[PDB]
Structure 1
Amino acid sequence: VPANSTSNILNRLLVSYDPRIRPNFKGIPVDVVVNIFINSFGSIQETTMDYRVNIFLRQKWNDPRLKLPSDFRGSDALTVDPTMYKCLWKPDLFFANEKSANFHDVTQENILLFIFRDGDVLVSMRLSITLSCPLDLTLFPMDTQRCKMQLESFGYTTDDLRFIWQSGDPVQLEKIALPQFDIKKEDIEYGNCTKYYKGTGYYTCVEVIFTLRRQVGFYMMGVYAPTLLIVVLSWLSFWINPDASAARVPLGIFSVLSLASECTTLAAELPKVSYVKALDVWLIACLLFGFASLVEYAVVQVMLNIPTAAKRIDLYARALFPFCFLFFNVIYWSIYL
């Protein structure tokens, strides 16, 4: 019996198979197992609140109409030309927190299709979906976001279709590297959400929750240390003699303006949000410190019209600005560790 006869008598319009009818029609529901594989992860764009993942979506169920009889022993499993996946029954499945999802067809539809003796099926299909995870940026450069991926079903209720994760090792990912964030292979929390859309009924859903712990490297290097240098330069401004009146105001002025420009840059690199970000806290604090240096020079000038008062002002400033700045830095790090 050639293999064409096998595939035909198994699944095709030439045999008594109907794909438009799920298995166990008007009977027991379907228990769909699932298991993901993260091949690529990144391209996170906080401005659009999305992250791109290229994965292999594996889903195995049982379809009694597919039953390799004992008449032949070629294998307990069986692999088939991917072009048959469109013939037999496929379960409705969509990622709900999705914005753009495209297959990956190159030289063939990137699709697997295994079959077993008792009827178990297994289909894997490459995907590159651009999900969406609403970010919490109350503490941006040290945030711990939880970007999720909640599978669902659209044309089948919870009374006919049913998703469940793989018992052991549902998600997999090897040698994963992100520039900014760092995934935790252990914090891979997954659970049910069982969406209930009004007007239709109860629909199933199973969610993965990747815990992304951003690191403070690039930000510490690009926004923190420069502002720290600016503020210590504002401090330095004090050691000058007040008799100048033109060699001490420019330091504070340009410090203020550079901090404002840094704020503009950071706001243009990130999304517009109502709440405040710890980075903006630090930056406005440094800005107020520069402004304080400037008003200190001002108070000196007013006291200049006198020498003892000016010396007292300048010394108290040189001794107060660094101590207060250091206390602020201490509390800031101890709060936003």
Structure 2
Amino acid sequence: STSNILNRLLVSYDPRIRPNFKGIPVDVVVNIFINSFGSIQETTMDYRVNIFLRQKWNDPRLKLPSDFRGSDALTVDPTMYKCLWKPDLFFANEKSANFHDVTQENILLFIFRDGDVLVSMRLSITLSCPLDLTLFPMDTQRCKMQLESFGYTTDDLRFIWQSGDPVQLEKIALPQFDIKKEDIEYGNCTKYYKGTGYYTCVEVIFTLRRQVGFYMMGVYAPTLLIVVLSWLSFWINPDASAARVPLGIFSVLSLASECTTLAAELPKVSYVKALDVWLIACLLFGFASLVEYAVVQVMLNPTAAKRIDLYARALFPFCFLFFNVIYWSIYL
């Protein structure tokens, strides 16, 4: 029978023992494929991915006999793979991951005649990367993905990416990011844990360029609108103290409320960020406008108010334009 071929293949085959026990280390080629690259959770400094991990290697004990020929390969059922030997390919920086058996364990197994098997199990992982927050509205994040063994050493196991396309993403469509050309650098990354030895590693580095569109029309525009509103309030008769005063306190209160609302949602870090410095500058400008009005009122108690009023209404536009141009020159 056809199953008799795999029965003869598996007889006297102990999966607990790696191929070439006393021989050279086995080089296991690893291929990856992104299927649904989920968003990143800045609050948890992690991102969720769903991949079709693939492994191939050489197992001389699984060479096909002279009887069976086949077209290209004989694919056994997915449930058979519990009887084979596999590398302990785990993810070093994993926070939590799980298999998928919604209807059946999603594993594809191919066996070549010369004794090279391909095993592909679906994986769903939640990796973690150090989220840098400097220049937050235009940051360039780099999230890592490490693959390494745990139950062997560099003398028994080895991981090398395919010479072709190790990553073959079809479509990403991230809600607020985009990736075009990643790199497979930091290829070896060979871990060296004291007390056990050297473990093989391989790394993959992505590149995220955050879409500044949302924050451009979500936070920057209201702050600019409030600043312009304060400037227009500046164009009112100082004698109407009941009128000029509220339109500066409203500006500063709105700036403070916006800062508080938009600060508690981002992850907490102990260094300043571009959005925060922009908000601080806008708040300080509103505060300075209110203080200038106060000093104008003090000078009132004649043309003494007129000179300072015109000087400030001329200086504020140029000063804020200079600040805006230097900011967008230094952060873009």
**Is the pair's TM-score, using the shorter chain for normalization, greater than 0.5?**
yes
TM-score, normalised relative to structure 1: 0.95
What CA distance in whole angstroms lies between the structure 2 residues aligned with 1:297 and 1:200? Answer: 71
2:39–2:175 Cα contact (<8 Å) kept: no
Secondary structure of residue in 2 paired with 1:286: helix
Identity %: 100
The Cα RMSD (Å) is: 1.6
2:45–2:130 Cα contact (<8 Å) kept: yes
> Structure 1, residues 53-103: CA drift from partner, whole Å, max 9, x if none?
100000100001101123222223121111011110010111111101011
2:9–2:64 Cα contact (<8 Å) kept: no
**For residue 105 of structure 1, what is the aligned residue in structure 2?**
101
2:182–2:205 Cα contact (<8 Å) kept: no
What CA distance in whole angstroms lies between the structure 1 residues aligned with 2:304 and 2:147? Answer: 71
Shift in alpha-carbon separation, 1:187–1:194, aligned structure 2, 3 A: closer
> Structure 1, residues 161-191: CA drift from partner, whole Å, max 9, x if none?
1001111101111122011111123556452
**For residue 322 of structure 2, what is the aligned residue in structure 1?**
327
Deviation (angstroms), 1:9: 5.8
What CA distance in whole angstroms lies between the structure 2 residues aligned with 1:187 and 1:234? Answer: 49
TM-score, normalised relative to structure 2: 0.96
Q: Give unmatched runs, 5+ long, in structure 1.
A: none
Higher mean displacement: 146-155 or 254-263: 254-263
Deviation (angstroms), 1:261: 1.2
1:111–1:124 Cα contact (<8 Å) kept: yes
Question: What aligned pairs does 1:20-169 form with structure 2 within 5 A after superposition?
Answer: 20-169=16-165
> Structure 1, residues 246-282: CA drift from partner, whole Å, max 9, x if none?
2112111111111111111221111110011011010
Shift in alpha-carbon separation, 1:311–1:74, aligned structure 2, 3 A: same
1:163–1:206 Cα contact (<8 Å) kept: yes
Structure 1: 4+ residue segments shifted above 3 A: 5-14, 186-190
What CA distance in whole angstroms lies between the structure 2 residues aligned with 1:157 and 1:270? Answer: 41
Shift in alpha-carbon separation, 1:312–1:11, aligned structure 2, 3 A: farther
Deviation (angstroms), 1:137: 1.0
What CA distance in whole angstroms lies between the structure 2 residues aligned with 1:196 and 1:8? Answer: 45
Shift in alpha-carbon separation, 1:135–1:311, aligned structure 2, 3 A: same
Higher mean displacement: 68-77 or 240-249: 68-77
Shift in alpha-carbon separation, 1:26–1:300, aligned structure 2, 3 A: same
What CA distance in whole angstroms lies between the structure 2 residues aligned with 1:33 and 1:52? Answer: 24
Q: Give unmatched runs, 5+ long, in structure 2.
A: none
Shift in alpha-carbon separation, 1:14–1:120, aligned structure 2, 3 A: closer
Deviation (angstroms), 1:42: 2.0
